[PDB]
Ligand binder design. Structure first.
Ligand SMILES: Cn1c(N2CCC(C)(N)CC2)nc2[nH]nc(-c3cccc(Cl)c3Cl)c2c1=O
Length: 487
């Protein structure tokens, strides 16, 4: 349930909603109208409404007078289970004020004719594939596919702000109606059970026709709607992050609330003979990756223990050490030609090679007191990503990725590619998803199916909030487009 997020409301609409339909402790979140890319958390307290700014430049959600989070749902879950934390006065998030607007649902298709929706369910649908469109006069149509085959249309009437299928219950939202008939399916007179198994997949595109999709997603934007429908699916990804919350592990996190999932975290087995198994890092399985945060002075040894145990031969750094006067990642590698020890691990910097968009460092890693453990580790340091937003052209990112890929393909039995930035979720997620998408187009060529949100969602179940902003989302499409056009 992420119903507390209203995508199409102004600050004034939000104020009236919380005053007339809410109580003290009532809250909602919404996208900013005065500055796109920002969010507002509106809370009712002592009869008055407080508007709290949330910012996302692409690394994390930064709440004003609060903490840094991987997702809006992780933010809201934290403040609803940690009172007295949001402020002089304490602001309590007690009651989420639900949104009835169906615009961010995977099944809602707004304007769509009966023939067009039937063409979509006939060409793309399967058993249980459904969608909801606007009639065809203020009413709605639920269109479902059944078989292994036919298409049924269930009329949905909007009467006095309530929704119904002809008889029975009247629902406050189309969502409450859809969720009801998902659990208890409508049975036709002659035995057909109208199972609402999955929403109709319309995001899956053929690689060769990316330029067509990008053109449409750019029309009044379509990119904003597809991304917001993906954000609404983040409430299904609140997996436990217990290990990261342990007292002994707290100072091993760059941002106390951006934690690895327990089910995919990297477990370190080197073990200095109390709590030596932790790193803020996750395994990302589509060639594998490891997504991690930028080192802290106290986590550099753990970082090399990870690289060594995982047999990784390639590291992708997507940040400068220092950005906007803030430490983003500590320097975990020696100076060129220098040799250094990071606990039981030894690193030599053999050669540094500068290119326009990046530096390549040839590092040799080994365990101290064991010469035959030596292996070359290639460090790809991308240096030209802007402090805010994304590069305006994907060429540089694409050339860099093409080079990282060839290095990784040339090494036999290379472990996962290590990818990091600051919190290890924004730029990191962006690099991994482009890399996953372009890998499909490598083996299967131009005549293959690519599904950007399905890929992001799959990467997000392995690490919280991978791909942070709408701009990164649009950058993923632009990069895939450029790759297919330069083939
Ligand atoms: C159909 N669909 C739309 N649509 C439909 C209706 C529309 C015209 N209103 C806008 C675009 N957007 C989306 N974004 N993400 C997804 C998505 C895809 C696969 C897995 C997961 Cl988990 C997600 Cl979330 C998704 C989606 O399925």
């Amino acid at each position: 349930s992420r119903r507390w997020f209203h995508p199409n409301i102004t600050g004034v609409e939000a104020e009236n909603l919380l005053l007339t339909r809410g109580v003290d402790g009532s809250f909602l979140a919404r996208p900013s109208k005065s500055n796109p890319g920002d969010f507002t958390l509106s809370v009712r307290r002592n009869g008055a409404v407080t508007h709290i700014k949330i910012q996302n430049t692409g690394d994390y959600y930064d709440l004003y007078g609060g903490e840094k989070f991987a997702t809006l749902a992780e933010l809201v879950q934290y403040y609803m289970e940690h009172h007295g934390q949001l402020k002089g006065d304490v602001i309590e998030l007690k009651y989420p004020l639900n949104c009835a607007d169906p615009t961010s649902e995977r099944w809602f298709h707004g304007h769509l004719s009966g023939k067009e929706a039937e063409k979509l369910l006939t060409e793309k649908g399967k058993h249980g594939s459904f969608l909801v469109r606007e009639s065809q006069p203020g009413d709605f149509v639920l269109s479902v596919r059944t078989g292994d085959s036919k298409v049924t249309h269930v009329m949905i009437r909007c009467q006095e702000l309530k929704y119904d299928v002809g008889g029975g219950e009247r629902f406050d939202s189309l969502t409450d109606l859809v969720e009801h008939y998902k659990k208890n399916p409508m049975v036709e007179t002659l035995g057909t059970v109208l199972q609402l198994k999955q929403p109709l997949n319309t995001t899956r595109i053929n690689a060769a026709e990316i330029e067509s999709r990008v053109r449409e997603l750019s029309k009044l934007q379509g990119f904003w709607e597809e991304f917001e429908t993906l954000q609404q699916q983040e409430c299904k990804l609140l997996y436990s992050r217990k290990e990261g919350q342990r007292q002994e592990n707290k100072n091993k996190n760059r941002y106390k609330n951006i934690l690895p999932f327990d089910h995919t975290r990297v477990v370190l087995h080197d073990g200095d003979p109390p709590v030596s198994d932790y790193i803020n890092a996750n395994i990302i399985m589509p060639k594998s990756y490891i997504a991690t945060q930028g080192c802290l002075q106290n986590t550099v040894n753990d970082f090399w223990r990870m690289v060594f145990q995982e047999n990784s031969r390639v590291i992708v750094m997507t940040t400068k050490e220092v950005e906007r006067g803030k430490s983003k990642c500590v320097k975990y590698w020696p100076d060129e030609y220098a040799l250094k020890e990071y606990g039981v691990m030894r690193v030599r910097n053999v050669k540094e090679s500068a290119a326009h968009d990046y530096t390549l460092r040839e590092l040799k890693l080994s365990k101290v007191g064991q010469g035959n453990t030596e292996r070359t580790v290639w460090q790809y340091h991308f240096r030209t990503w802007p402090d805010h937003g994304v590069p305006s052209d994907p060429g540089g990112v694409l050339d860099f990725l093409e080079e990282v890929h060839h290095k990784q393909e040339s090494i036999m039995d290379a472990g996962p590619v290590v990818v990091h930035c600051s919190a290890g979720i924004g730029r990191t997620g962006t690099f991994i998803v482009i890399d996953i998408l372009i890998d499909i187009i490598r083996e299967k060529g131009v005549d293959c199916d690519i599904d950007v949100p399905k890929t992001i969602q799959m990467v997000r179940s392995q690490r919280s909030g991978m791909v942070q902003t709408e701009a990164q989302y649009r950058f993923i499409y632009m990069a895939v487009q450029h790759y297919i056009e330069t083939l």
